[PDB]
């Protein structure tokens, strides 16, 4: 357990992946979402002493051949003996031996293994030499991207060195590294090295199970790049993956050069990521531009959280290939309705169930204003689905409008012939009565934006809202006394604080006669309640006091706290009453500039 | 100072570099080795209130043109007005404005500025449009490596986004980012954008001050790659840099294709590193393979700790160029004696002062075994320099022997005709009597290794060392009684513990007669003091007990603690007495297996 020169051999629970480390720093944490079991023993070569803690004694080093046995690579040792490599790695020189573990030899195909045992003089010797370098190279010398000639026919050894400490040779991970030998060093790797493929393109053209992906590739003029030099990571979708897609989707993406090209580039990484370098979740930029999330669940590689990898670490002269169960479809290749996620299903179901999905033609460009599922109450879903169909028609535009194109005062046109006002604030974008959330996406033929509430375009003007309610009567009269009816009737952008008749019943009529004598003070007192521009409370950043200049001249202060709108530190009763030419906030008492 | 919505404008002491941040996380630390001065004020748009801390009030947003004034870019505002760009950035649409600061316009060349003021209708408008994007892009949207078309002739804007948070456009750093406008966003940049060069190669061919580097480039066949697409960082050495080198060095490197090619690739980075992204020291891999250290002292860019950059941020369609005062010479292009550093100067002076430097021919391959300066005592430097010349001749090999080629039992041949034994241990490599330190380097025509002590090849065998000292007399007799003289005379590798005559004077002769009757126990008792192989105490790892198998059979335990060799927990008097065929450790009393 505790002591000097103690080594821990961990194994991820539920897998065969083993990680061998010294006890210098704590290495204990979940790997690939799973805990590990640990085996403590003296690091190879070190020994225990009586009455002492740990392993304070050490044995002398041996030659490379004996070090094969010191590290437990007894099968590699036997094969080294049978091929007469033993006498070379016992003599003069300095050698690096990437020795496959015993389990690595057990995992090798039986026909290949028997083929090696039947030709020990040449083929077996050439394979073991393929596992070797004619110089001593520690793991700190095996830099990422190095191509080091081996000891057989100068065959290239492709080194990868990752920030997490994983060192791979032809994607074979080094389990036990840096066992010093009198004439070299031994590193125990997790698989037997094999002949690398010619290139990724050549593997695609050769493999029949990648026929579909090949065709698409040749259609997208991207297969040529996968044959040139480089260090790519390709997530190749098999023919099963293409069969999984809905009908016509593959035909639709293939019929369009842009969607097909983006679809192809979305599977390719510009760097080499061996499977054994994945110890957790990370994001990687694809050639399409957008990223994919690569992770691991036990010994299963996950792509975008899906355990879709079935065959991994297909190494080739220009990078690695991992076969996957599904096709990776980037947003830039999806139809607009396909851009929605979980919290929009209701919306996307409704527009499908009420006959609007067919109106989103592939040759058109559209914008979906999708409310979250929480925005559809039972009372809303209980209305007649024709009215609900009109409402949904207020959430679809026949023009693609990206989030980066919206501006204050912009007017959007729904497919239902209605107009939507865009209000841009410092920290929020609100369309009519609904404000945007995060999660906007752009696709092949449109964009989608997520909203907290259902968008309901206003139907009454300020004047109609004022005269339809009785509690505003007196105030309305004053507004008409100031010749503001034409303002409250014509289109525009205003913010009006409407004091109820209760505020004037705090004046009790007499002060309305005292104010009636003033044909000028009513202009100030009344005009202070009006402000140019539409300022809704749910568009503010919470807690911050907004200083606005009313049309009267003096300042007014609006603060949104706990979903309540305060005006001059006075809690308003009703707020965000939308009209066609402004917004109304109902206040309890009168407002003065002070 | 403290409060919400407070912004800090820092300036690196001694420079003009300003960094504008909000007070969300502590941003206060030295940048480029210098402290900063800080200016606290409400973030633009926010206001203070009576009796409140910080800036809890806010003003409404404005259009892009007014936001130019809100952020202090009043000169950009004036130029926008004079070119009639103002009415466009006040109207419909969504714009990103990379507004140069007032200081940025002051730094612009006066002739170019006056040329813009004399053609406001087209040229000035086209430049300001070159500073703009026709969509709203926050800094989080300006991903690294993006080439975003501007609003003039679709001119490319080269985005770089660094892990430290620095965002640059054509290497112009964004000082104040993300000022939201009703119709866009304003980012204040630190310089006026100019037309990017055609390519790095074209700038090299055009610039006369890079004539030398051009020639070398054309000689190394690397100038073609600097004209193809990419994102390179080139540290171009001027003709002054080449003039600085010693005589013939440039001719020597140019006459060799390998040294010239490595010399050229050592100046080139595979990624784009704008100067304003450098806030501290970091290492970068060059195209040659080895790394360079890039840092900053105030506003001076440092390369390998030298303030050699004089003109920086020469942006071109395929990367950035920084002109430097010196030539970057990688180890792979240096003669072997040029590989030594500070702690080897004495050595490199000696071999030069005693006439050995000329023997290191460029067409030969050599290995220097350089002791540190601390290894040359005054008594050593006081010997006749001819003996010292022989000693130095024991530190030079006429064959290149890399550190990764040394193996246990190897015999090296000095230029003085002497032989050096290589002893490889688990954690140390010792040559004869001296053990290696870190810092081995490889060059054009040799390698260098650093040693703690002067290498003195042994001259006497075990037998000669035994008979030349009287305190060993008795023991020597016993060794000759066991027929070991031929072993102590012939070459080999042994470790002998020699008990002095004081140990046998603890037996007082009589026990030598009691042992004299035993013609077999003397074989065990004597042979226990001998061990196959050479084990010197300074080759051990400190504190660890080395378990060795003596030639008698039983185990012996050697531990090096506080530069003292303990054998079976017995402090030895003298240790590491080197002989031609072994090593001697003088013990106080006899040794028994026990
Ligand atoms: Ca052995
Ligand atoms: Ca390492
Ligand atoms: Ca192991
Ligand atoms: Ca094409
Ligand atoms: Ca989702
Ligand atoms: Ca507004
Ligand atoms: Ca203005
Ligand atoms: Ca950012
Ligand atoms: Ca500023
Ligand atoms: Ca060439
Ligand atoms: Ca140095
Ligand atoms: Ca030895
Ligand atoms: Cl470790
Ligand atoms: Cl954990
Ligand atoms: Cl053990
Ligand atoms: Cl055997
Ligand atoms: Cl690891
Ligand atoms: Cl390792
Ligand atoms: Cl070694
Ligand atoms: Cl990871
Ligand atoms: Cl994770
Ligand atoms: Cl239907
Ligand atoms: Cl219906
Ligand atoms: Cl876009
Ligand atoms: Cl309207
Ligand atoms: Cl916003
Ligand atoms: Cl109503
Ligand atoms: Cl005021
Ligand atoms: Cl910030
Ligand atoms: Cl500091
Ligand atoms: Cl202030
Ligand atoms: Cl003006
Ligand atoms: Cl920063
Ligand atoms: Cl910033
Ligand atoms: Cl905006
Ligand atoms: Cl940095
Ligand atoms: Cl630093
Ligand atoms: Cl001389
Ligand atoms: Cl001399
Ligand atoms: Cl090398
Ligand atoms: Cl010898
Ligand atoms: Cl070593
Ligand atoms: Cl002597
Ligand atoms: Cl024993
Ligand atoms: Mg094995
Ligand atoms: Mg690899
Ligand atoms: Mg396929
Ligand atoms: Mg792997
Ligand atoms: Mg929904
Ligand atoms: Mg938003
Ligand atoms: Mg009223
Ligand atoms: Mg509100
Ligand atoms: Mg300015
Ligand atoms: Mg840039
Ligand atoms: Mg030059
Ligand atoms: Mg810069
Ligand atoms: Mg020296
Ligand atoms: Mg060493
Ligand atoms: Mg004696
Ligand atoms: Mg010692
Ligand atoms: Na606001
Ligand atoms: Na040792
Ligand atoms: Zn205002
Ligand atoms: Zn031994």
UniProtKB/Swiss-Prot annotation, chains A, B:
<comment type="function">
    <text>Induces cell attachment and spreading and plays a role in cell adhesion. Enhances incorporation of BMP1 in the fibronectin matrix of connective tissues, and subsequent proteolytic activation of lysyl oxidase LOX.</text>
</comment>
<dbReference type="GO" id="GO:0001666">
    <property type="term" value="P:response to hypoxia"/>
</dbReference>
<dbReference type="GO" id="GO:0071356">
    <property type="term" value="P:cellular response to tumor necrosis factor"/>
</dbReference>
<dbReference type="GO" id="GO:0030198">
    <property type="term" value="P:extracellular matrix organization"/>
</dbReference>
<feature type="modified residue" description="S-cysteinyl cysteine">
    <location>
        <position position="23"/>
    </location>
</feature>
<dbReference type="GO" id="GO:0001953">
    <property type="term" value="P:negative regulation of cell-matrix adhesion"/>
</dbReference>
<keyword id="KW-0358">Heparin-binding</keyword>
<dbReference type="GO" id="GO:2000343">
    <property type="term" value="P:positive regulation of chemokine (C-X-C motif) ligand 2 production"/>
</dbReference>
<keyword id="KW-0964">Secreted</keyword>
<dbReference type="GO" id="GO:0005802">
    <property type="term" value="C:trans-Golgi network"/>
</dbReference>
<dbReference type="GO" id="GO:0009888">
    <property type="term" value="P:tissue development"/>
</dbReference>
<dbReference type="GO" id="GO:0032355">
    <property type="term" value="P:response to estradiol"/>
</dbReference>
<feature type="domain" description="FAS1 2">
    <location>
        <begin position="197"/>
        <end position="328"/>
    </location>
</feature>
<dbReference type="GO" id="GO:0008593">
    <property type="term" value="P:regulation of Notch signaling pathway"/>
</dbReference>
<dbReference type="GO" id="GO:0031594">
    <property type="term" value="C:neuromuscular junction"/>
</dbReference>
<keyword id="KW-0130">Cell adhesion</keyword>
<dbReference type="GO" id="GO:0007155">
    <property type="term" value="P:cell adhesion"/>
</dbReference>
<dbReference type="GO" id="GO:1990138">
    <property type="term" value="P:neuron projection extension"/>
</dbReference>
<keyword id="KW-0333">Golgi apparatus</keyword>
<feature type="domain" description="FAS1 1">
    <location>
        <begin position="60"/>
        <end position="193"/>
    </location>
</feature>
<dbReference type="GO" id="GO:0014850">
    <property type="term" value="P:response to muscle activity"/>
</dbReference>
<dbReference type="GO" id="GO:0044344">
    <property type="term" value="P:cellular response to fibroblast growth factor stimulus"/>
</dbReference>
<feature type="disulfide bond">
    <location>
        <begin position="32"/>
        <end position="296"/>
    </location>
</feature>
<dbReference type="GO" id="GO:0003073">
    <property type="term" value="P:regulation of systemic arterial blood pressure"/>
</dbReference>
<feature type="glycosylation site" description="N-linked (GlcNAc...) asparagine">
    <location>
        <position position="562"/>
    </location>
</feature>
<protein>
    <recommendedName>
        <fullName>Periostin</fullName>
    </recommendedName>
</protein>
<dbReference type="GO" id="GO:0014911">
    <property type="term" value="P:positive regulation of smooth muscle cell migration"/>
</dbReference>
<keyword id="KW-0301">Gamma-carboxyglutamic acid</keyword>
<keyword id="KW-1015">Disulfide bond</keyword>
<dbReference type="GO" id="GO:0009612">
    <property type="term" value="P:response to mechanical stimulus"/>
</dbReference>
<dbReference type="GO" id="GO:0008201">
    <property type="term" value="F:heparin binding"/>
</dbReference>
<feature type="disulfide bond">
    <location>
        <begin position="430"/>
        <end position="435"/>
    </location>
</feature>
<keyword id="KW-0325">Glycoprotein</keyword>
<dbReference type="GO" id="GO:0046872">
    <property type="term" value="F:metal ion binding"/>
</dbReference>
<dbReference type="GO" id="GO:0062023">
    <property type="term" value="C:collagen-containing extracellular matrix"/>
</dbReference>
<feature type="domain" description="EMI">
    <location>
        <begin position="3"/>
        <end position="57"/>
    </location>
</feature>
<keyword id="KW-0677">Repeat</keyword>
<dbReference type="GO" id="GO:0005615">
    <property type="term" value="C:extracellular space"/>
</dbReference>
<dbReference type="GO" id="GO:0071307">
    <property type="term" value="P:cellular response to vitamin K"/>
</dbReference>
<keyword id="KW-0272">Extracellular matrix</keyword>
<feature type="domain" description="FAS1 3">
    <location>
        <begin position="331"/>
        <end position="455"/>
    </location>
</feature>
<dbReference type="GO" id="GO:0031012">
    <property type="term" value="C:extracellular matrix"/>
</dbReference>
């Amino acid at each position: 357990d505790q002591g000097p020169n103690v080594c821990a051999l961990q194994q991820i629970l539920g897998t065969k992946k083993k990680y061998f480390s010294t006890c210098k720093n704590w290495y204990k944490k979940s790997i690939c979402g799973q805990k590990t079991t640990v085996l403590y023993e003296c690091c190879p070569g070190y020994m225990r002493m009586e009455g002492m803690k740990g392993c304070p004694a050490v044995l002398p080093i041996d030659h490379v051949y004996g070090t094969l046995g010191i590290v437990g690579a007894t099968t590699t040792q036997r094969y080294s003996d049978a091929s007469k490599l033993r006498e070379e790695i016992e003599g003069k020189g300095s050698f690096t031996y990437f020795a496959p573990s015993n389990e690595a030899w057990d995992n090798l195909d039986s026909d290949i293994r028997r083929g090696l045992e039947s030709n020990v003089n040449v083929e077996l010797l050439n394979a073991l030499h393929s596992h070797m370098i004619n110089k001593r190279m520690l793991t700190k010398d095996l830099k990422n991207g190095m191509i080091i000639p081996s000891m057989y026919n100068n065959l290239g050894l492709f080194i990868n060195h990752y920030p997490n400490g994983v060192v791979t040779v032809n994607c074979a991970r080094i389990i036990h590294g840096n066992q010093i030998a009198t004439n070299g060093v031994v590193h125990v790797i997790d698989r037997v090295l094999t002949q690398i493929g010619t290139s990724i393109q050549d593997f695609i053209e050769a493999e029949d199970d990648l026929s579909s992906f090949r065709a698409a590739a040749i259609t997208s003029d991207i297969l040529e790049a996968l044959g040139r030099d480089g260090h790519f990571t390709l997530f190749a979708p098999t023919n099963e993956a293409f069969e999984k897609l809905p009908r016509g989707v593959l035909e639709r993406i293939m019929g369009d050069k842009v969607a097909s090209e983006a679809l192809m580039k979305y599977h390719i990484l510009n760097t080499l990521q061996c499977s054994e370098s994945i110890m957790g979740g990370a994001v990687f930029e694809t050639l399409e531009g957008n990223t994919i999330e690569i992770g691991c669940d036990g010994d299963s590689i996950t792509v975008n959280g899906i355990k879709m990898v079935n065959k991994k670490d297909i190494v080739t002269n220009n990078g690695v290939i991992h076969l996957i169960d599904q096709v990776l479809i980037p947003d830039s290749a999806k139809q607009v309705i396909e851009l929605a996620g979980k919290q929009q299903t209701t919306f996307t179901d409704l527009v499908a169930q009420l006959g609007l999905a067919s109106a989103l033609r592939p040759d058109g460009e559209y914008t979906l204003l999708a409310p979250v599922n929480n925005a559809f109450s039972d009372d809303t879903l209980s209305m007649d689905q024709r009215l609900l169909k009109l409402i949904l028609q207020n959430h679809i535009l026949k023009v693609k409008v990206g989030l980066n194109e919206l501006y204050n005062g912009q007017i959007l046109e729904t497919i239902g012939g209605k107009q939507l006002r865009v209000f841009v604030y410092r920290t929020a974008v609100c369309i009519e009565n609904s404000c945007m959330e995060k999660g906007s996406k752009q696709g092949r033929n449109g964009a989608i934006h997520i909203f907290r509430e259902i968008i309901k375009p206003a139907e009454k003007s300020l004047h109609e809202k004022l005269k339809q309610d009785k509690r505003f009567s007196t105030f309305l009269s004053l507004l008409e006394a100031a010749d503001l009816k034409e303002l409250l009737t014509q289109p525009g952008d205003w913010t009006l604080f409407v004091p109820t008749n209760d505020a004037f019943k705090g004046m009790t009529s007499e002060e309305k006669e005292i104010l009636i004598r003033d044909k000028n003070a009513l202009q100030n007192i009344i005009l202070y309640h009006l402000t140019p521009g539409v300022f809704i409370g749910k568009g503010f950043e919470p807690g911050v006091t907004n200083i606005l200049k009313t049309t009267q001249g003096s300042k007014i202060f609006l603060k949104e706290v706990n979903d309540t709108l305060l005006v001059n530190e006075l809690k308003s009763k009703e707020s965000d009453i939308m009209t066609t030419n402004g917004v109304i906030h109902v206040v309890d008492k009168l407002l003065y500039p002070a």
